[PDB]
Design a protein around this motif. Structure first.
Motif, short mmCIF file in Angstrom:
data_model
loop_
_atom_site.label_atom_id
_atom_site.label_comp_id
_atom_site.label_asym_id
_atom_site.label_seq_id
_atom_site.Cartn_x
_atom_site.Cartn_y
_atom_site.Cartn_z
N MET B 56 0.84 -1.18 0.00
CA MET B 56 0.00 0.00 0.00
C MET B 56 0.88 1.25 0.00
O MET B 56 2.11 1.17 -0.12
N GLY B 57 0.25 2.41 0.12
CA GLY B 57 0.98 3.66 0.14
C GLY B 57 0.38 4.69 -0.79
O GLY B 57 0.44 5.89 -0.51
N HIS B 58 -0.20 4.23 -1.89
CA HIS B 58 -0.80 5.14 -2.85
C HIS B 58 -2.12 5.70 -2.32
O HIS B 58 -2.78 5.11 -1.47
N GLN B 59 -2.49 6.86 -2.86
CA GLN B 59 -3.72 7.53 -2.47
C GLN B 59 -4.91 7.12 -3.33
O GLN B 59 -6.06 7.25 -2.87
N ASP B 60 -4.68 6.64 -4.54
CA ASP B 60 -5.77 6.31 -5.46
C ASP B 60 -5.28 5.26 -6.44
O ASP B 60 -4.22 4.65 -6.25
N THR B 61 -6.06 5.04 -7.50
CA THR B 61 -5.74 4.02 -8.49
C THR B 61 -4.50 4.41 -9.28
O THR B 61 -4.35 5.56 -9.70
N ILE B 62 -3.62 3.44 -9.50
CA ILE B 62 -2.38 3.64 -10.24
C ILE B 62 -2.50 2.94 -11.58
O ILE B 62 -2.85 1.75 -11.64
N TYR B 63 -2.22 3.67 -12.65
CA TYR B 63 -2.30 3.12 -14.00
C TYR B 63 -0.98 2.51 -14.47
O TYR B 63 -0.98 1.78 -15.47
N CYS B 64 0.12 2.78 -13.78
CA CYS B 64 1.43 2.30 -14.18
C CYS B 64 2.15 1.69 -12.99
O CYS B 64 2.24 2.30 -11.93
N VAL B 65 2.66 0.47 -13.18
CA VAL B 65 3.56 -0.17 -12.23
C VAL B 65 4.74 -0.72 -13.03
O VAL B 65 4.56 -1.31 -14.09
N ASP B 66 5.95 -0.47 -12.53
CA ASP B 66 7.16 -0.86 -13.24
C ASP B 66 8.12 -1.55 -12.29
O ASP B 66 8.26 -1.16 -11.13
N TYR B 67 8.78 -2.59 -12.79
CA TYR B 67 9.86 -3.26 -12.09
C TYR B 67 11.15 -3.03 -12.87
O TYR B 67 11.19 -3.26 -14.09
N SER B 68 12.19 -2.58 -12.18
CA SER B 68 13.45 -2.26 -12.84
C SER B 68 14.11 -3.53 -13.38
O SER B 68 13.98 -4.62 -12.81
N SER B 69 14.82 -3.37 -14.50
CA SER B 69 15.38 -4.51 -15.22
C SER B 69 16.49 -5.21 -14.45
O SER B 69 16.86 -6.33 -14.81
N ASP B 70 17.06 -4.57 -13.42
CA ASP B 70 18.02 -5.26 -12.58
C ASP B 70 17.33 -6.05 -11.47
O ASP B 70 17.88 -7.05 -10.98
N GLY B 71 16.14 -5.62 -11.05
CA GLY B 71 15.36 -6.34 -10.07
C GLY B 71 15.66 -6.00 -8.63
O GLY B 71 14.95 -6.49 -7.73
N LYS B 72 16.68 -5.18 -8.37
CA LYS B 72 17.03 -4.85 -6.99
C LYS B 72 16.00 -3.93 -6.35
O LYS B 72 15.75 -4.03 -5.14
N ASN B 73 15.39 -3.04 -7.13
CA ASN B 73 14.43 -2.09 -6.60
C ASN B 73 13.39 -1.81 -7.68
O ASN B 73 13.47 -2.32 -8.80
N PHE B 74 12.40 -1.00 -7.33
CA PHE B 74 11.38 -0.58 -8.29
C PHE B 74 10.84 0.77 -7.86
O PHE B 74 11.23 1.33 -6.83
N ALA B 75 9.92 1.31 -8.66
CA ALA B 75 9.27 2.57 -8.35
C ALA B 75 7.78 2.43 -8.60
O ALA B 75 7.34 1.62 -9.42
N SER B 76 6.99 3.22 -7.87
CA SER B 76 5.54 3.19 -7.99
C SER B 76 5.01 4.62 -8.09
O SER B 76 5.42 5.49 -7.32
N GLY B 77 4.09 4.83 -9.03
CA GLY B 77 3.46 6.12 -9.21
C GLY B 77 2.14 5.94 -9.93
O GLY B 77 1.85 4.88 -10.49
N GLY B 78 1.34 7.01 -9.92
CA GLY B 78 0.03 6.95 -10.55
C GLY B 78 -0.76 8.24 -10.46
O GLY B 78 -0.23 9.32 -10.73
N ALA B 79 -2.04 8.12 -10.10
CA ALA B 79 -2.94 9.27 -10.05
C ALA B 79 -2.78 10.10 -8.78
O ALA B 79 -3.43 11.15 -8.66
N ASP B 80 -1.95 9.67 -7.84
CA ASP B 80 -1.72 10.41 -6.60
C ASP B 80 -0.69 11.51 -6.75
O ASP B 80 -0.40 12.20 -5.76
N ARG B 81 -0.11 11.68 -7.94
CA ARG B 81 0.91 12.68 -8.26
C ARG B 81 2.19 12.49 -7.45
O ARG B 81 2.98 13.43 -7.30
N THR B 82 2.42 11.29 -6.92
CA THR B 82 3.62 10.97 -6.16
C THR B 82 4.30 9.76 -6.78
O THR B 82 3.64 8.82 -7.21
N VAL B 83 5.63 9.80 -6.82
CA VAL B 83 6.43 8.66 -7.26
C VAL B 83 7.35 8.28 -6.12
O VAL B 83 8.13 9.12 -5.64
N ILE B 84 7.27 7.03 -5.67
CA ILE B 84 8.04 6.55 -4.53
C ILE B 84 8.88 5.37 -4.98
O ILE B 84 8.37 4.44 -5.62
N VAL B 85 10.17 5.40 -4.65
CA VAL B 85 11.09 4.32 -4.97
C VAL B 85 11.14 3.36 -3.79
O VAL B 85 11.37 3.77 -2.65
#
Lengths: 971, 734
Positions: B56-85
Motif C-alpha cells: 500500500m501507500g498510494h492515495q488512489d488508483t495507479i495506471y502504471c507499475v514498473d519493475y526495474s530490469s536489474d530487479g534490486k528495486n522498483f518505483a511506484s506512481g500513478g494518479a496520486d501525483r507521487t512517485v516513490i522508490v
C-alpha cells in the motif's frame, strides 16, 4: 587421445619463436621470431608426409623489423596476415610458391593486439591496445572502425558470423555486431571469482557447430590464472567450467571443434623444472591427455589442417607432436564399425561395414560414449541425456539390429566387455551385466546372439573395497563408501577381470563366480590395460607413457598385495594402440609412436612403418584400418583403407613358398606349429595341386571338412577340374568359371554359380549357350525384400510370378495393371480369388466380379457387391448368372432403404424392376404412418398405388378391386 | 492451441465496484508477479499463486507499475501525483510528489534511472540526480517505450504522434498516427540492425515503424482495438488485447494467429514471464490468471514423410529415410494439416491451401500451390486425397473439391472420432471412419454407402487398417487394443491392455507396433511374443526395417530386430516364416545359425537358400555331400555328421554311438588320425585290426618308423613288418 612427440625442427640462428600459425588449405605452417624473422614451411599432411613427417618446402620471408608476434591464416583464399612489435601489419598472397606482400599498414600510435577472420573468410578484424578496432574486407576495403573507451586484450569472431567477441585487459568479454560495431551484450563469467581484474589467455569460438539443434561448448574464455570456462551460446547460464591448476598461456581448437588444447610454461620452481605442458580437453571440459616438453618459454600452438598433429613453439624451435584421437571403433565378424559426427545433428552416426561385401548400415545413436566387440556381438554405451546421469547399454549384432538394452543411473567412466558379460566402472563402483551363461561355449550352432536373447540376463553391482566371494548374493545398491583411491583403468578377460587404481593397486576378480581372487601392485596408476588370450600375461600403459607387460599366474593368486612379475624383452614408450592374438597368448601387436612393433614371446620385430589404427590380430595376420582419412569421408568407405600385415613367421613362410621346397615348408610348420602355417601350406599345395602334401597339414590343423574336400578332389580324376574346385574352394570363382568354360562343362559351372547365389551370374551364364525363370524370381525376391518395388515388379513380370506381381501392384497402388492379371491366370485357380479379394477391399467391385467369373463363382461376387453396396450391379450380376435368389437381395435392398428412409429410391427401384403389389404394400406401410397424423399425402400414396396396379396390366403384356377400394377409401 | 490455467486470482468487489488490475510487470527473477490492482500492489509467486507481498501507500488508483530490469528495486506512481522508490522488500527510501499525475512509468533498461511524464514536460529522475530535468512537451504524454539499447525513449501523445528529442543529433523523428497511442513496443530482436517499433492504433490498424518513422512491412487490419503489447518468445510473437476480450498472438508482420487466453471484459495489460512459458493478464474485474501455454504439436505422417508446425506459421516437412528437411512459410496459424502421397492440405483461419512436391530432374524437393479455397469452415477432422479434400464436423462429412464445391456427404448415427485415408484408386479411394458407437467403416468417395468393417462396444478413438487391408487394429476409450482379421467374421487375433498407440507395417504383411502405457514399445510378428524396447513416446509409423516414434516435439526412428523374431521362429521349429523374417536383413552369424538349425532339423531346402548370404564356403561345401547318399536310420547320419563340422568332434561321436553308427565313427576317427579315440569306440576285433593296420600304414610315411615296425608286427603281416623294420635300423632286435 594420445599425444606423443614426433619431430623437432630448429629454425635458423637460434632465435626464440613467438608466433605459430598453420594453414588448413595446403599445410603452410608459419613461424615468427625476434628481429623481424618470418619463416614459412610447407609440410605434407598426406600419408607420404604423415609417417615420415615430410617437410616438403621452406621459405624465409622478410619485411618485418621487430619481433613477429601475430600471425594468422585464411584457408579459403590461402592468405596470410602478419604483424610485429613495431606495428607493421602485412598481408601475404601466395603465387607460384612465392609469398608477395599485398598491403602494409601501421597505426603508428597503438600496438596491434590480435587478428580475427570471419568463418567465411571475407572480413578481418584488427584490434589495438588502446581499443582501436578496424574491420576490413578480404580484398582490403575498409568497412568501419571504432574506438572503444577501454583497452582490449583479445578478439574472436562469433560463430554465426554476424557478431564479434572482444576481451579486455581487465578480463571483461563484450559481444558486438559485425556490421554496426555497437556494444550488443556482455557475456557472464562464473569461473572467475570477480575479486580483481585478470587478463585472459585465450578467446576462441569454433564455428563447426553453427547449424546444430543443441550447440556444443565451442566457446572458450580462460584467464591467466588457469580457470577454463566453456559456453554454448553468448549468454548461456550453464557453463561447463572445468578448472586446471596450471596457468594458461595459449589455447587452440582443433579443426573439427572436438578438442581444445591449453598450453602452460612451468618454471624451475618445482622439482620437475621448467617445461612446456599442454593439456587437451574435450567439449565438456574432460581432461584427455597431457604432453610435457623440456623448455623455458612458449611461443604458441597450432593444429594441423587434418587435426592429427600440433605444432608447438618451444624456446627457439618447434615440436610436431602427433595426436591420435580416441576414435570409437571396433572390428568383428569381417565387419568394421565406427562413429562420426554430422555437422547439423546433435546425435552421432554409427556406421557398420561388411568389408567382404562393402555393404553399409547406418545407425543413429544419441550421445554415444563407448563401443566394443567380441565374437559376433557389439556393445554400445551411450548417454541419451547429458542432463541426467543415465547410461544406456545396447547389444547389437553385426548388421546393427539391437538385441538387449539396460539402463544405469550412475556416472560411468570406464567400460569393457567379453564373450559373456559387459563390465563398467565409475570412480568406486563396478557394474557387471552377465548376459550369457559362461559355462556354455559360443559356437556356430549356438552363437552369442541367441544366448544373449533367449537366456536370462543377471546383473550385479559391486564395490571395489569389499572382498567378494561366491557366497554373497548379487545386489543393486550404489554403495558410495568413499575410498581415497579410485578406479583408473579396467580390462576384462574371458575368465578374469582386472582393475587398476590411481594408488597403483590392482585387483584380479573371477567372473563365474565373481570372487576377488588376487591382488597386485604397480609402479604407478594405469592409463590403459589389456590381457592376453588365456589371461597368462597383461599389458599396462602407465601415466608416464611407460608401457609394461606383467605376468600373472593362477597359483600366484594371493590376497596380500605382492609384486607382479614383469616379462622381459618388452619395454616401450608412447604406445597408443594395442592388440593381442586370438590364438597366440604370446604374440601381440603394438602401435608405438609412428610405427608398429609386432612381438612374439617377448622379443620384438622389424618396425613396420604405419599409421592405421589397429583392429584385429588373428592367425598370424594383422588387419588394421586407416581411420585418419576415412573419417574425412565416412559416408563412402573404401576397401583400400583396410591393410593386412603379416608377422615374421607368416612372411618367412610366404618367402619359403615363393622359392623353396614343400619339404622346407613342412619342416617350417613342424618347427613352429601354428594353425595358419598349416592352412597356408595346405592351400599352396592345393594351388599347385600337391594333393598328397595337404592332408597332413589339414590334420595338424584338425579340419575334418577340409579332409573330406581333399578326399573328394582325390576321387576326381582330371588335371583341370581339381584345380577348378580348388579355385572355387578359396572364393576365387572368377577364374573357376573360366576353367569350367575351358572344357565347356556348364552343367557344373551353372551349379557353382547357383550355389554361390550370384543370380546375376546365373542369368549371365544361362542366357548364353527353366532355371532362368528361377534366377529371375530370386532376383525379384531380393529386390522386394530390399523394398525396391519397381525393379522387383520388372523381374516378377519377366519371370511371370503373378502373385508377387499383385503384391507389388497393391503396394504401389497400380490398380489399372492389377486389374489386368486376370487375363493371364485362367489355367490356375487361387489367383482370381486372391486379387478379387484384394480388389473388393480397394472397392473395385466390377473387376473383382470379373475375376470371380473367371474363378467360376459370382455368388461371392454378388456378396461383395452387396458389401460394397453396388446393389444395381449386384442385381444385374445375379440375373445374368441365373441366381434366382434375387428375391432375398431385393428384400435386403428394400430393408436397407427403409432403414435409410429412402422411399424414393425404393419406389424407383421397384418401377424399374416391374414389381407392383408388394411394392404398393410397402409404400402403404409408410402411408398409414403418414396417415395417422397428416394424411393429405396418404391419399396421394394410395392414388399412385392404384396407378402402379393399373400399370401392372400393361406390364403383363380378389386384389384386383381391393387395391381400388383402398385407394378410394381416402377419397 | 492448448491453454493451461496454472492459477487464477480475482479481486473482491468494493462498494459494488470490482477494482481493475490497471497494469502489471514481471520481475527479472520472474518469481515476483507484480500487478497494480486499483490502489493495491500485489506481488504473487508464479510457481504457487501465493500473495507474497501486499504493498500500500498510494492515495488512489495507479495506471502504471514498473519493475526495474536489474530487479534490486522498483518505483511506484500513478494518479496520486507521487512517485516513490521502493527496495526489493518494498521499503520506501525517499517519497516525492510530482506536479502531474503520471500514467506511464519508464525505467531505463540499461541503467537505474527513470523517466517521469507530466502534463507539460518529461523529466529524468535518478538516485544520483534528485533534481528532475523536465524538458517541455507539446502536451501530456501517454505511454513511453525504451529500446533494448536504452538510448532512445519514444514518448506517446493523444494525437498518435510519437515525438523524439535525440540527445546527440538535433534531428527529430515524429511518426503520425490517426489514433491515440495507448501502447507502443520496441522489439528485443534487432533484425539486421533495424528496429521494429510496433504501434497498435485504435482505428483497427497495426503498424510497424523504425526509428526513422518509415512504414515497416504491411499495416494490418484487426478485429479489435489493441490495448496492450508484449513480445513473446524473445520477440518472435506479439501479444494483443481488445474488443474480443482475449489475449491474442500475432506474428512479426502483424498476422493474427490465435487468441491465447480468454477473459470476461477489457484486458488492461498482459505480460509474459521471461525465460518461462507462463504469462499473466489483468482485467477490469480484478481477475488475474497465470497461464501456462503448454506447447501443442500437430503432426501428419504418411509412410516415410513427416510434417509438423514450427513457429506457429511454418509447415516443416521432414523425410526420414533420406533425411531431407524443407520449410514452407505461411505467415498464418494452422491447426489442422493433412497429407497423402505427393499431396498435402493446410487449413488457415479462412484459407485452405493444397501443396504438391515433385521428383524433379534437379533432385530437389520443391512445393507449389495448386488448390486454394477462400472459405471459412469449422471442421473437427481433415483429410486430403488426390481427388478431393474431406472435412468433417460432428457427423457431417463435406467433400469439397479443389475449389470449394460439394461432392458427397454421410450422416452417421453417432459423431466420428477418427478420419484417415488408407488409399485406393483415384476417385475410388478408401476412407476409414470410426464413430463413437464403436463402429469402423470404409467410406468410399464413389459409393455413398459405407462398407461394414467392424462394430464394437466401447467408442473407437483410434484404429488402423493393415497395409494388405485384411486386418484391423483398434483401441477403445478404455485403452484396450484389439486386432481383427477382417472378413465376413471379424476374428480376434489378439487383444492387449493399456495401449497408447498402434501401427501396422506398411511393407510387410503382419508386423504390428504398440506403445503401452508404461512407455514400453512393443513389436509383434505373427503369434510370437512382443519384443520390447522401453522407449519414451508413441509409435506413429511402421515401415519394413524401421519403426517411427514421436515424443513431445522429438521425432526419431527406431530399428526393427528381425533376428529377434528369427530366434523364436527357430526355437519352435517354424523355419518357413523364419526365412522371410531373416530376408529383411540379419547378421551373418544369424544366417549361419539358421542354416545350421535347418540342416539339423532335416530341412535342407531352406538350408540351401540361407547359405547364400554368408560368403563362407567352409560350410556350404557340406550340401553337395548329401544327395548321393539320399538317392540310395539312414536320416540319422545327417543329424550326426553336422556337429563335427562346427569344430568339436566328441559330440559327433556321441551321437554316432547313440544311433548305433559305430562304423561311421570309426571311419571319422580314422580320418582324424588320432587312433586312441577310435580305440575307445571300437567294438569288433576285426575293426580293431583294420584300424591298427591303417595306423601302421599311416606311420609308415609319418616319418616315425620305430613305432611303425611294432605296429606292423601287431598287424600280424610279418612280411610288411620286416620291410618297414629294415629301414628303422634296430639291428639288436633285428
Amino acid at each position: 587421445m594420445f599425444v606423443y612427440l614426433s619431430k623437432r625442427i630448429a629454425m635458423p640462428n637460434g632465435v626464440k619463436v613467438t608466433s605459430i600459425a598453420w594453414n588448413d588449405g595446403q599445410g603452410w605452417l608459419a613461424c615468427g621470431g625476434e628481429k623481424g624473422l618470418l619463416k614459412v614451411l610447407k609440410v605434407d599432411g598426406g600419408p607420404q608426409g604423415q609417417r615420415s613427417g615430410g617437410l616438403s618446402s621452406s621459405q624465409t620471408l622478410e619485411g618485418h623489423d621487430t619481433t613477429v608476434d601475430l600471425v594468422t591464416w585464411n584457408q579459403q583464399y590461402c592468405k596470410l596476415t602478419s604483424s610485429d612489435v613495431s606495428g607493421r601489419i602485412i598481408v601475404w598472397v601466395l603465387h607460384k610458391g612465392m609469398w608477395f606482400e599485398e598491403m602494409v599498414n601501421n597505426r603508428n600510435s597503438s600496438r596491434v593486439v590480435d587478428f580475427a577472420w570471419n568463418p567465411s573468410g571475407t572480413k578481418i578484424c584488427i584490434t589495438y591496445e588502446d581499443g582501436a578496432v578496424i574491420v576490413g574486407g578480404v580484398d582490403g576495403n575498409r568497412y568501419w572502425g571504432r574506438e572503444l573507451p577501454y583497452k582490449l586484450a583479445k578478439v574472436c569472431w562469433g560463430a554465426d558470423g554476424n557478431s564479434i567477441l572482444f576481451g579486455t585487459a581487465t578480463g571483461e568479454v563484450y559481444v558486438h555486431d559485425a556490421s554496426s560495431g555497437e556494444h550488443l551484450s556482455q557475456v557472464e563469467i562464473k569461473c572467475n571469482d570477480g575479486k580483481a581484474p585478470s587478463p585472459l589467455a585465450g578467446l576462441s569460438w569454433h564455428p563447426a557447430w553453427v547449424e546444430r539443434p543443441e550447440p556444443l561448448a565451442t566457446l572458450a574464455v580462460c584467464y591467466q590464472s588457469g580457470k577454463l570456462q566453456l559456453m554454448t551460446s553468448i549468454g548461456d547460464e550453464t557453463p561447463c567450467n572445468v578448472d586446471r591448476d596450471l596457468p594458461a598461456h595459449f589455447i587452440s581448437w582443433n579443426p573439427s571443434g572436438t578438442v581444445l588444447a591449453v598450453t602452460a610454461a612451468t618454471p624451475a620452481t618445482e622439482e620437475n623444472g621448467p617445461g612446456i605442458v599442454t593439456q587437451f580437453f574435450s567439449t565438456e571440459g574432460v581432461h584427455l591427455r597431457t604432453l610435457r616438453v623440456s623448455g623455458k618459454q612458449c611461443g604458441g600452438i597450432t593444429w594441423e589442417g587434418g587435426g592429427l598433429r600440433v605444432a608447438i613453439g618451444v624456446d627457439s624451435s618447434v615440436y610436431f607432436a602427433n595426436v591420435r584421437p580416441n576414435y570409437k571403433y571396433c572390428y568383428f565378424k569381417k565387419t568394421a564399425v565406427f562413429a562420426f559426427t554430422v555437422p547439423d545433428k546433435v546425435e552421432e552416426s554409427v556406421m557398420f561395414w561388411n568389408v567382404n561385401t562393402n555393404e553399409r548400415r547406418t545407425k543413429s545413436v544419441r550421445g554415444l560414449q563407448y563401443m566394443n566387440a567380441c565374437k559376433d556381438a557389439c556393445v554400445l554405451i551411450s548417454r541419451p541425456d547429458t542432463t541426467q546421469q543415465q547410461r544406456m547399454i545396447q547389444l547389437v549384432n553385426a548388421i546393427g539390429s539391437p538385441l538387449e538394452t539396460r539402463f544405469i543411473d550412475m556416472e560411468l567412466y570406464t567400460y569393457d566387455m567379453n564373450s559373456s558379460a559387459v563390465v563398467c566402472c565409475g570412480d568406486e563402483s563396478i557394474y557387471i551385466w552377465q548376459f550369457r551363461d559362461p559355462s556354455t561355449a559360443v559356437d556356430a550352432l549356438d552363437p552369442i546372439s541367441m544366448q544373449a536373447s533367449r537366456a536370462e540376463s543377471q546383473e550385479r553391482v559391486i564395490h571395489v573395497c569389499d572382498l567378494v566371494r561366491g557366497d554373497t548374493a548379487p545386489t543393486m545398491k550404489v554403495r558410495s563408501a568413499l575410498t581415497n583411491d579410485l578406479i583408473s583403468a579396467m580390462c576384462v578377460s574371458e575368465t578374469h577381470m582386472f582393475v587398476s587404481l590411481e594408488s597403483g593397486t590392482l585387483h584380479v576378480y573371477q567372473l563365474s563366480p565373481l570372487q576377488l581372487v588376487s591382488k597386485y601392485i604397480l609402479f604407478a596408476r594405469a592409463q590403459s590395460m589389456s590381457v592376453n588370450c588365456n589371461s597368462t600375461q597383461l599389458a599396462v600403459i602407465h601415466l608416464g607413457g611407460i608401457t609394461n607387460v606383467y605376468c600373472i599366474e593362477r597359483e600366484k593368486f594371493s590376497l596380500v598385495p605382492c609384486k607382479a612379475d614383469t616379462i622381459d624383452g618388452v619395454e616401450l614408450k608412447d604406445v597408443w594402440n594395442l592388440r593381442w592374438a586370438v590364438d597366440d597368448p604370446h604374440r601381440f601387436a603394438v602401435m608405438e609412436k609412428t610405427r608398429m612393433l609386432v612381438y612374439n614371446h617377448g622379443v620384438a620385430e622389424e618396425p613396420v612403418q604405419s599409421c592405421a589404427n589397429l583392429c584385429k590380430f588373428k592367425s598370424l595376420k594383422i588387419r588394421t584400418l586407416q581411420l585418419d582419412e576415412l573419417l574425412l569421408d565416412p559416408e563412402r568407405p573404401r576397401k583400400d583403407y583396410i591393410v593386412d600385415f603379416e608377422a615374421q613367421l607368416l612372411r618367412d613362410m610366404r618367402a619359403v613358398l615363393r622359392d623353396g621346397t614343400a619339404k622346407e615348408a613342412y619342416e617350417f610348420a613342424e618347427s613352429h606349429n601354428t594353425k595358419k602355417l598349416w592352412e597356408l601350406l595346405a592351400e599352396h599345395t592345393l594351388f599347385q595341386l600337391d594333393f598328397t602334401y595337404a592332408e597332413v597339414a589339414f590334420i595338424h590343423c584338425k579340419d575334418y571338412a577340409a579332409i573330406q574336400f581333399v578326399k573328394r578332389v582325390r576321387s576326381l580324376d582330371d588335371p583341370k577340374k581339381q584345380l577348378a574346385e580348388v579355385n572355387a574352394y578359396y572364393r576365387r570363382f572368377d577364374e573357376a568359371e573360366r576353367l569350367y568354360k575351358d572344357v565347356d562343362r556348364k552343367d557344373l559351372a551353372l551349379d557353382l554359380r547357383y550355389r554361390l547365389g550370384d543370380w546375376f551370374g546365373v542369368v549371365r551364364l544361362v542366357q548364353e549357350g527353366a532355371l532362368l525363370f528361377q534366377a529371375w524370381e530370386n532376383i525379384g525376391d531380393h529386390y522386394a525384400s530390399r523394398q525396391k518395388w519397381s525393379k522387383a515388379a520388372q523381374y516378377y513380370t519377366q519371370c511371370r510370378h503373378y502373385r508377387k506381381l499383385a503384391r507389388i501392384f497393391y503396394i504401389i497402388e497400380d490398380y489399372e495393371m492389377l486389374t489386368q492379371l486376370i487375363s493371364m491366370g485362367e489355367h490356375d485357380k487361387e489367383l482370381m480369388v486372391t486379387l478379387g479379394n484384394m480388389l473388393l477391399t480397394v472397392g473395385l467391385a466390377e473387376e473383382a466380379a470379373k475375376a470371380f467369373i473367371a474363378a467360376n463363382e459370382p455368388r461371392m461376387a454378388v456378396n461383395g457387391c452387396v458389401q460394397v453396396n453396388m446393389w444395381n450391379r449386384a442385381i444385374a450380376l445375379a440375373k445374368e448368372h441365373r441366381l434366382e435368389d434375387v428375391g432375398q437381395l431385393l428384400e435386403k435392398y428394400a430393408k436397407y432403404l427403409i432403414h435409410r428412409e429412402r422411399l424414393t429410391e425404393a419406389i424407383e427401384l421397384y418401377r424399374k424392376a416391374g414389381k407392383h403389389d408388394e411394392a404398393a404394400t410397402l409404400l402403404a406401410q409408410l402411408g398409414k404412418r403418414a396417415a395417422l397424423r397428416d394424411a393429405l399425402k396418404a391419399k396421394k400414396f394410395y392414388v399412385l398405388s392404384a396407378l402402379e396396379v393399373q400399370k401392372y396390366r400393361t406390364t403383363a403384356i380378389r386384389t384386383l378391386d381391393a387395391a381400388w377400394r383402398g385407394a378410394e377409401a381416402y377419397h | 492451441m492448448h491453454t493451461s490455467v496454472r492459477w487464477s486470482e480475482t479481486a473482491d468487489a468494493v462498494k459494488g465496484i470490482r477494482p481493475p488490475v490497471n497494469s502489471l510487470c514481471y520481475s527479472p527473477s520472474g518469481d515476483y508477479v507484480v500487478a497494480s490492482c486499483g490502489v493495491r500492489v500485489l506481488v504473487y509467486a508464479a510457481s504457487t499463486g501465493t500473495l507474497l507481498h501486499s504493498l500500500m501507500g498510494h492515495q488512489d488508483t495507479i495506471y502504471c507499475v514498473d519493475y526495474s530490469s536489474d530487479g534490486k528495486n522498483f518505483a511506484s506512481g500513478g494518479a496520486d501525483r507521487t512517485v516513490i522508490v521502493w527496495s526489493s522488500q518494498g521499503e520506501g527510501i525517499v517519497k516525492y510528489q510530482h506536479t502531474e499525475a503520471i500514467q506511464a512509468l519508464a525505467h531505463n533498461p540499461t541503467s537505474s534511472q527513470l523517466a517521469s511524464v507530466s502534463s507539460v514536460d518529461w523529466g529524468i529522475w535518478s538516485p544520483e540526480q534528485p533534481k528532475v530535468s523536465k524538458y517541455s512537451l507539446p502536451s501530456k504524454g501517454l505511454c513511453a517505450a525504451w529500446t533494448p539499447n536504452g538510448k532512445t525513449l519514444a514518448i506517446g501523445m493523444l494525437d498518435g504522434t510519437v515525438m523524439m528529442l535525440s540527445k546527440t543529433s538535433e534531428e527529430k523523428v515524429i511518426i503520425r498516427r490517426p489514433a491515440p497511442v495507448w501502447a507502443l513496443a520496441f522489439t528485443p530482436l534487432r533484425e539486421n540492425g533495424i528496429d521494429v517499433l510496433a504501434i497498435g492504433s485504435w482505428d483497427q490498424r497495426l503498424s510497424f515503424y523504425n526509428l526513422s518513422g518509415t512504414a515497416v512491412g504491411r499495416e494490418r487490419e484487426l478485429d479489435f482495438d489493441p490495448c496492450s503489447v508484449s513480445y513473446f518468445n524473445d520477440g518472435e510473437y506479439i501479444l494483443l488485447s481488445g474488443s474480443d476480450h482475449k489475449v491474442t498472438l500475432f506474428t512479426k508482420d502483424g498476422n493474427r494467429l490465435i487468441e491465447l487466453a480468454s477473459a470476461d471484459d477489457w484486458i488492461w495489460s498482459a505480460r509474459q514471464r521471461p525465460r518461462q512459458k507462463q504469462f499473466c493478464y489483468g482485467t477490469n474485474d480484478g481477475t488475474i490468471s497465470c497461464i501456462d501455454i503448454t506447447i501443442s504439436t500437430v503432426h501428419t505422417i504418411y509412410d516415410d514423410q513427416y510434417v509438423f508446425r514450427k513457429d506457429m506459421t511454418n509447415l516443416v516437412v521432414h523425410q526420414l529415410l533420406v533425411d531431407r528437411k524443407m520449410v514452407i512459410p505461411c505467415n498464418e496459424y494452422v491447426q489442422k494439416i493433412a497429407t497423402f502421397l505427393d499431396k498435402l492440405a493446410v487449413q488457415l483461419q479462412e484459407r485452405v491451401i493444397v501443396f504438391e512436391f515433385f521428383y524433379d530432374d534437379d533432385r530437389t524437393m520443391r512445393y507449389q500451390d495448386i488448390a486454394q479455397i477462400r472459405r471459412r469452415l469449422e471442421c473437427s477432422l481433415l483429410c486430403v486425397t488426390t481427388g478431393a479434400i474431406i472435412v468433417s464436423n460432428d457427423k457431417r462429412i463435406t467433400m469439397y473439391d479443389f475449389q470449394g464445391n460439394k461432392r458427397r456427404e454421410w450422416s452417421m448415427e453417432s459423431p466420428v472420432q477418427l478420419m484417415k485415408v488408407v488409399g485406393g484408386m483415384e476417385g475410388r479411394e478408401i476412407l476409414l471412419v470410426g464413430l463413437n458407437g464403436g463402429q469402423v467403416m470404409k467410406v468410399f468417395v464413389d459409393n455413398p454407402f459405407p462398407t461394414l468393417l467392424h462394430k464394437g462396444t466401447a467408442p473407437v478413438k483410434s484404429a488402423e487398417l493393415s497395409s494388405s487391408r485384411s486386418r484391423l487394429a483398434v483401441i477403445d476409450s478404455t485403452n484396450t487394443l484389439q486386432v481383427l482379421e477382417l472378413g465376413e467374421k471379424n476374428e480376434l487375433l489378439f487383444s492387449e491392455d493399456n495401449v497408447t498407440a498402434v501401427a501396422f507395417n506398411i511393407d510387410v504383411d503382419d508386423n504390428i507396433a504398440f506403445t503401452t502405457g508404461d512407455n514400453t514399445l512393443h513389436i509383434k510378428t505373427g503369434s510370437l511374443p512382443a519384443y520390447q524396447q522401453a522407449v519414451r513416446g508413441i509409435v506413429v509409423g511402421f515401415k519394413a526395417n524401421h519403426v517411427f516414434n514421436l515424443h513431445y516435439s522429438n521425432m526419431m526412428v527406431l530399428d526393427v530386430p528381425h533376428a529377434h523374431a528369427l530366434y523364436k521362429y527357430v526355437e519352435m521349429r517354424d523355419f518357413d516364416r523364419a526365412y522371410e523374417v531373416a530376408c529383411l536383413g540379419v547378421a551373418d552369424a544369424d544366417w549361419k545359425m539358421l542354416g545350421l538349425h535347418a540342416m539339423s532339423q532335416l530341412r535342407l531346402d531352406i538350408a540351401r537358400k540361407a547359405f547364400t548370404h554368408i560368403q563362407d564356403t567352409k560350410l556350404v561345401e557340406l550340401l553337395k555331400s548329401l544327395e548321393l547318399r539320399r538317392r540310395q536310420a539312414k536320416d540319422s547320419v545327417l543329424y550326426g555328421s553336422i556337429l563335427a563340422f562346427q569344430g568339436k568332434y566328441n559330440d559327433a561321436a556321441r551321437q554316432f554311438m547313440k544311433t548305433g553308427c559305430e562304423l561311421k565313427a570309426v571311419e571319422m576317427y580314422c580320418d582324424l588320425k588320432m587312433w586312441d579315440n577310435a580305440k575307445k569306440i571300437c567294438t569288433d576285433e576285426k575293426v580293431l585290426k583294420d584300424l591298427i593296420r591303417q595306423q601302421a600304414r599311416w606311420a609308415e610315411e609319418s616319418q616315425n618308423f620305430v613305432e611303425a615296425a611294432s605296429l606292423y608286427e601287431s598287424c600280424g603281416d610279418y612280411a610288411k613288418a620286416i620291410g618297414m623294420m629294415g629301414q628303422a635300423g634296430q639291428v639288436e632286435k633285428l
